[PDB]
Symmetry: C3
Protein backbone atom coordinates (compact mmCIF):
# COMPACT_ATOMS: atom_id res chain seq x y z
CA UNK A 1 0.00 0.00 0.00
CA UNK A 2 1.00 3.59 -0.69
CA UNK A 3 2.96 5.50 1.96
CA UNK A 4 2.35 9.26 2.05
CA UNK A 5 3.80 11.99 4.25
CA UNK A 6 1.68 13.33 7.12
CA UNK A 7 1.19 17.10 7.18
CA UNK A 8 3.79 18.64 9.52
CA UNK A 9 1.48 21.32 11.00
CA UNK A 10 -2.04 21.02 12.37
CA UNK A 11 -4.59 23.40 13.90
CA UNK A 12 -5.30 21.06 16.79
CA UNK A 13 -3.57 18.42 18.88
CA UNK A 14 -0.67 16.94 16.88
CA UNK A 15 0.03 13.27 16.16
CA UNK A 16 3.49 11.81 15.56
CA UNK A 17 5.67 13.91 13.27
CA UNK A 18 3.36 16.92 13.66
CA UNK A 19 3.44 20.23 15.48
CA UNK A 20 0.57 22.49 16.44
CA UNK A 21 0.43 25.69 14.38
CA UNK A 22 1.08 28.87 16.37
CA UNK A 23 -1.38 31.57 15.36
CA UNK A 24 -0.55 35.24 15.89
CA UNK A 25 -1.43 36.22 19.46
CA UNK A 26 -2.46 39.56 20.94
CA UNK A 27 0.38 40.87 23.11
CA UNK A 28 3.27 39.32 21.18
CA UNK A 29 5.62 41.56 19.20
CA UNK A 30 4.41 41.97 15.60
CA UNK A 31 7.47 41.41 13.39
CA UNK A 32 8.59 40.42 9.90
CA UNK A 33 11.88 39.23 8.41
CA UNK A 34 15.27 40.97 8.55
CA UNK A 35 16.68 39.62 5.25
CA UNK A 36 15.35 39.69 1.69
CA UNK A 37 14.44 35.97 1.65
CA UNK A 38 14.05 35.10 5.35
CA UNK A 39 10.66 34.01 6.67
CA UNK A 40 11.05 34.90 10.35
CA UNK A 41 8.71 37.10 12.37
CA UNK A 42 5.29 36.60 13.91
CA UNK A 43 3.50 38.17 10.91
CA UNK A 44 4.84 35.35 8.70
CA UNK A 45 4.72 32.51 11.20
CA UNK A 46 1.43 30.67 10.63
CA UNK A 47 1.65 31.27 6.86
CA UNK A 48 5.08 29.60 6.81
CA UNK A 49 3.59 26.56 8.53
CA UNK A 50 0.72 26.40 6.03
CA UNK A 51 3.31 26.54 3.23
CA UNK A 52 5.21 23.64 4.83
CA UNK A 53 1.97 21.70 4.55
CA UNK A 54 1.50 22.74 0.92
CA UNK A 55 5.00 21.50 0.05
CA UNK A 56 4.18 18.11 1.59
CA UNK A 57 0.87 17.90 -0.31
CA UNK A 58 2.79 18.57 -3.53
CA UNK A 59 5.14 15.69 -2.72
CA UNK A 60 2.23 13.38 -1.87
CA UNK A 61 0.54 14.18 -5.18
CA UNK A 62 3.84 13.20 -6.86
CA UNK A 63 3.86 9.85 -5.04
CA UNK A 64 0.33 9.15 -6.27
CA UNK A 65 1.27 10.24 -9.79
CA UNK A 66 4.15 7.75 -9.96
CA UNK A 67 1.96 4.90 -8.72
CA UNK A 68 -0.85 5.84 -11.14
CA UNK A 69 1.60 6.01 -14.08
CA UNK A 70 2.68 2.45 -13.22
CA UNK A 71 -0.96 1.36 -13.02
CA UNK A 72 -1.63 2.95 -16.40
CA UNK A 73 1.34 1.15 -17.96
CA UNK A 74 0.31 -2.17 -16.35
CA UNK A 75 -3.22 -1.74 -17.73
CA UNK A 76 -1.88 -0.98 -21.23
CA UNK A 77 0.25 -4.15 -21.07
CA UNK A 78 -2.82 -6.23 -20.13
CA UNK A 79 -4.85 -4.60 -22.93
CA UNK A 80 -2.09 -5.54 -25.42
CA UNK A 81 -1.59 -9.08 -24.14
CA UNK A 82 -4.03 -10.67 -26.61
CA UNK A 83 -5.85 -12.65 -23.93
CA UNK A 84 -8.56 -14.88 -25.40
CA UNK A 85 -12.25 -14.39 -24.61
CA UNK A 86 -14.66 -17.18 -23.72
CA UNK A 87 -15.93 -19.65 -26.34
CA UNK A 88 -19.67 -20.13 -26.94
CA UNK A 89 -21.49 -21.95 -24.13
CA UNK A 90 -23.63 -24.24 -26.30
CA UNK A 91 -22.73 -27.80 -25.29
CA UNK A 92 -20.13 -28.04 -28.08
CA UNK A 93 -16.32 -28.26 -27.90
CA UNK A 94 -14.15 -25.54 -29.44
CA UNK A 95 -10.53 -25.27 -30.57
CA UNK A 96 -8.51 -22.14 -31.39
CA UNK A 97 -7.75 -21.18 -35.01
CA UNK A 98 -6.89 -17.85 -36.67
CA UNK A 99 -7.88 -15.84 -33.59
CA UNK A 100 -11.32 -17.44 -33.31
CA UNK A 101 -13.11 -20.35 -31.70
CA UNK A 102 -13.94 -23.13 -34.18
CA UNK A 103 -15.97 -26.28 -33.57
CA UNK A 104 -13.87 -29.35 -32.80
CA UNK A 105 -16.45 -31.41 -34.73
CA UNK A 106 -15.39 -29.82 -38.04
CA UNK A 107 -12.03 -31.64 -37.69
CA UNK A 108 -13.30 -35.09 -36.59
CA UNK B 1 -16.74 8.03 -10.43
CA UNK B 2 -14.73 9.51 -7.58
CA UNK B 3 -16.35 12.10 -5.32
CA UNK B 4 -13.99 14.68 -3.84
CA UNK B 5 -14.60 17.60 -1.49
CA UNK B 6 -14.74 21.12 -2.95
CA UNK B 7 -12.40 23.66 -1.36
CA UNK B 8 -14.34 25.62 1.29
CA UNK B 9 -12.70 29.01 0.58
CA UNK B 10 -12.09 30.79 -2.71
CA UNK B 11 -10.54 34.09 -3.79
CA UNK B 12 -13.46 34.94 -6.05
CA UNK B 13 -17.18 34.33 -6.33
CA UNK B 14 -18.08 31.15 -4.41
CA UNK B 15 -20.02 28.13 -5.68
CA UNK B 16 -22.11 25.83 -3.49
CA UNK B 17 -20.44 24.88 -0.22
CA UNK B 18 -17.88 27.68 -0.59
CA UNK B 19 -17.26 31.06 0.98
CA UNK B 20 -15.23 33.96 -0.34
CA UNK B 21 -11.98 34.51 1.55
CA UNK B 22 -11.81 37.77 3.49
CA UNK B 23 -8.42 39.40 3.03
CA UNK B 24 -7.09 41.86 5.60
CA UNK B 25 -8.49 45.32 4.88
CA UNK B 26 -7.10 48.77 5.59
CA UNK B 27 -9.17 50.40 8.34
CA UNK B 28 -10.15 47.23 10.20
CA UNK B 29 -8.68 46.54 13.64
CA UNK B 30 -5.46 44.50 13.37
CA UNK B 31 -5.78 41.70 15.94
CA UNK B 32 -4.54 38.23 16.86
CA UNK B 33 -5.81 35.50 19.18
CA UNK B 34 -6.54 35.76 22.91
CA UNK B 35 -5.78 32.11 23.85
CA UNK B 36 -2.72 29.93 23.29
CA UNK B 37 -4.37 27.82 20.56
CA UNK B 38 -7.15 30.08 19.22
CA UNK B 39 -7.02 31.29 15.63
CA UNK B 40 -9.16 34.43 15.89
CA UNK B 41 -8.13 37.92 14.83
CA UNK B 42 -7.80 39.67 11.48
CA UNK B 43 -4.04 38.95 11.27
CA UNK B 44 -4.81 35.20 11.20
CA UNK B 45 -8.04 35.28 9.22
CA UNK B 46 -7.13 34.61 5.58
CA UNK B 47 -4.37 32.18 6.63
CA UNK B 48 -6.94 30.15 8.61
CA UNK B 49 -9.09 29.92 5.49
CA UNK B 50 -6.14 28.78 3.38
CA UNK B 51 -5.43 26.11 6.02
CA UNK B 52 -9.06 24.94 5.83
CA UNK B 53 -8.41 24.41 2.12
CA UNK B 54 -5.17 22.54 2.82
CA UNK B 55 -6.98 20.17 5.20
CA UNK B 56 -9.54 19.39 2.49
CA UNK B 57 -6.79 18.79 -0.11
CA UNK B 58 -5.18 16.33 2.32
CA UNK B 59 -8.49 14.47 2.62
CA UNK B 60 -8.97 14.44 -1.16
CA UNK B 61 -5.49 12.99 -1.66
CA UNK B 62 -6.51 10.25 0.81
CA UNK B 63 -9.64 9.47 -1.22
CA UNK B 64 -7.52 9.11 -4.36
CA UNK B 65 -5.00 6.96 -2.48
CA UNK B 66 -7.69 4.49 -1.38
CA UNK B 67 -9.08 4.21 -4.92
CA UNK B 68 -5.58 3.79 -6.40
CA UNK B 69 -4.69 1.09 -3.84
CA UNK B 70 -7.81 -0.81 -4.96
CA UNK B 71 -6.81 -0.35 -8.61
CA UNK B 72 -3.32 -1.64 -7.83
CA UNK B 73 -4.73 -4.72 -6.08
CA UNK B 74 -7.20 -5.34 -8.95
CA UNK B 75 -4.33 -5.11 -11.46
CA UNK B 76 -2.21 -7.55 -9.43
CA UNK B 77 -5.14 -10.01 -9.37
CA UNK B 78 -5.48 -9.78 -13.17
CA UNK B 79 -1.70 -10.24 -13.59
CA UNK B 80 -1.90 -13.41 -11.43
CA UNK B 81 -5.01 -14.83 -13.09
CA UNK B 82 -3.09 -16.96 -15.61
CA UNK B 83 -5.12 -15.75 -18.57
CA UNK B 84 -4.10 -17.48 -21.80
CA UNK B 85 -2.58 -15.58 -24.73
CA UNK B 86 -3.60 -16.02 -28.36
CA UNK B 87 -2.64 -19.13 -30.36
CA UNK B 88 -0.71 -18.85 -33.64
CA UNK B 89 -2.75 -17.44 -36.54
CA UNK B 90 -1.57 -19.87 -39.22
CA UNK B 91 -4.70 -21.61 -40.52
CA UNK B 92 -4.23 -24.51 -38.08
CA UNK B 93 -6.29 -25.55 -35.05
CA UNK B 94 -4.77 -25.57 -31.56
CA UNK B 95 -5.60 -27.22 -28.24
CA UNK B 96 -4.25 -26.41 -24.77
CA UNK B 97 -1.65 -28.66 -23.09
CA UNK B 98 0.94 -28.02 -20.35
CA UNK B 99 0.49 -24.24 -20.56
CA UNK B 100 1.06 -24.10 -24.32
CA UNK B 101 -0.81 -24.26 -27.60
CA UNK B 102 -0.34 -27.58 -29.41
CA UNK B 103 -1.55 -28.55 -32.87
CA UNK B 104 -4.82 -30.49 -32.87
CA UNK B 105 -3.46 -32.48 -35.84
CA UNK B 106 -0.85 -34.19 -33.63
CA UNK B 107 -3.74 -36.00 -31.85
CA UNK B 108 -5.82 -37.01 -34.91
CA UNK C 1 2.84 10.04 -18.57
CA UNK C 2 0.80 12.49 -16.52
CA UNK C 3 1.54 16.21 -16.82
CA UNK C 4 0.88 18.27 -13.68
CA UNK C 5 1.27 21.98 -12.98
CA UNK C 6 4.31 23.15 -11.01
CA UNK C 7 3.56 25.26 -7.93
CA UNK C 8 3.84 28.96 -8.89
CA UNK C 9 5.45 30.11 -5.61
CA UNK C 10 8.36 28.66 -3.68
CA UNK C 11 10.21 29.52 -0.46
CA UNK C 12 13.61 29.20 -2.11
CA UNK C 13 15.23 29.63 -5.50
CA UNK C 14 12.58 29.29 -8.22
CA UNK C 15 12.65 27.01 -11.26
CA UNK C 16 10.89 27.73 -14.55
CA UNK C 17 7.36 29.06 -14.14
CA UNK C 18 7.97 29.84 -10.46
CA UNK C 19 8.53 32.94 -8.37
CA UNK C 20 10.09 33.24 -4.94
CA UNK C 21 7.57 34.07 -2.21
CA UNK C 22 8.05 37.49 -0.62
CA UNK C 23 7.65 37.24 3.15
CA UNK C 24 6.68 40.29 5.19
CA UNK C 25 9.81 42.32 5.98
CA UNK C 26 10.63 44.62 8.88
CA UNK C 27 10.71 48.21 7.62
CA UNK C 28 8.14 47.85 4.84
CA UNK C 29 4.74 49.52 5.20
CA UNK C 30 2.22 47.17 6.83
CA UNK C 31 -0.94 47.38 4.70
CA UNK C 32 -4.12 45.53 3.74
CA UNK C 33 -6.61 45.86 0.88
CA UNK C 34 -8.61 48.95 -0.13
CA UNK C 35 -11.66 47.14 -1.58
CA UNK C 36 -14.00 44.53 -0.12
CA UNK C 37 -12.59 41.66 -2.22
CA UNK C 38 -9.07 42.87 -3.13
CA UNK C 39 -6.05 40.97 -1.86
CA UNK C 40 -3.41 43.71 -2.00
CA UNK C 41 -1.21 44.84 0.88
CA UNK C 42 1.86 43.41 2.58
CA UNK C 43 -0.22 41.77 5.35
CA UNK C 44 -1.93 39.58 2.72
CA UNK C 45 0.99 39.07 0.37
CA UNK C 46 2.61 35.75 1.30
CA UNK C 47 -0.80 34.24 2.14
CA UNK C 48 -2.04 35.11 -1.37
CA UNK C 49 0.95 33.28 -2.83
CA UNK C 50 0.29 30.22 -0.67
CA UNK C 51 -3.33 30.28 -1.89
CA UNK C 52 -2.12 30.40 -5.51
CA UNK C 53 -0.26 27.19 -4.72
CA UNK C 54 -3.34 25.63 -3.12
CA UNK C 55 -5.41 26.38 -6.24
CA UNK C 56 -2.81 24.61 -8.39
CA UNK C 57 -2.74 21.59 -6.04
CA UNK C 58 -6.53 21.38 -6.37
CA UNK C 59 -6.20 21.34 -10.16
CA UNK C 60 -3.46 18.69 -10.02
CA UNK C 61 -5.62 16.47 -7.83
CA UNK C 62 -8.33 16.83 -10.50
CA UNK C 63 -5.91 15.72 -13.23
CA UNK C 64 -5.04 12.62 -11.20
CA UNK C 65 -8.73 11.95 -10.52
CA UNK C 66 -9.57 11.94 -14.24
CA UNK C 67 -6.70 9.57 -15.03
CA UNK C 68 -7.63 7.27 -12.12
CA UNK C 69 -11.30 7.20 -13.20
CA UNK C 70 -10.13 6.05 -16.65
CA UNK C 71 -7.91 3.40 -15.04
CA UNK C 72 -10.84 2.20 -12.94
CA UNK C 73 -13.08 1.94 -16.01
CA UNK C 74 -10.33 0.13 -17.97
CA UNK C 75 -9.90 -2.34 -15.10
CA UNK C 76 -13.67 -2.97 -14.94
CA UNK C 77 -13.69 -3.67 -18.69
CA UNK C 78 -10.86 -6.21 -18.30
CA UNK C 79 -12.66 -7.83 -15.34
CA UNK C 80 -15.80 -8.19 -17.51
CA UNK C 81 -14.01 -9.44 -20.61
CA UNK C 82 -14.46 -13.13 -19.78
CA UNK C 83 -10.81 -13.98 -20.40
CA UNK C 84 -10.13 -17.70 -20.00
CA UNK C 85 -7.82 -19.07 -17.29
CA UNK C 86 -5.16 -21.71 -17.85
CA UNK C 87 -6.05 -25.38 -18.42
CA UNK C 88 -4.62 -28.13 -16.19
CA UNK C 89 -0.91 -28.80 -16.71
CA UNK C 90 -1.06 -32.60 -16.63
CA UNK C 91 0.32 -33.78 -19.98
CA UNK C 92 -3.18 -33.95 -21.49
CA UNK C 93 -4.80 -31.83 -24.21
CA UNK C 94 -7.88 -29.71 -23.46
CA UNK C 95 -10.63 -28.09 -25.51
CA UNK C 96 -13.14 -25.43 -24.46
CA UNK C 97 -16.79 -26.32 -23.74
CA UNK C 98 -19.50 -24.63 -21.64
CA UNK C 99 -17.01 -22.29 -19.97
CA UNK C 100 -14.68 -25.10 -18.87
CA UNK C 101 -11.68 -27.08 -20.04
CA UNK C 102 -12.59 -30.61 -21.15
CA UNK C 103 -10.24 -33.41 -22.18
CA UNK C 104 -9.77 -33.74 -25.93
CA UNK C 105 -9.57 -37.52 -25.44
CA UNK C 106 -13.27 -37.69 -24.50
CA UNK C 107 -14.10 -36.74 -28.12
CA UNK C 108 -11.63 -39.03 -29.95
Amino acid sequence: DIVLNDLPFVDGPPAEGQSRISWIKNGEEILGADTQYGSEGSMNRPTVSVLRNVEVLDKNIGILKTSLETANSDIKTIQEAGYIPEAPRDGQAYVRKDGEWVLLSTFL
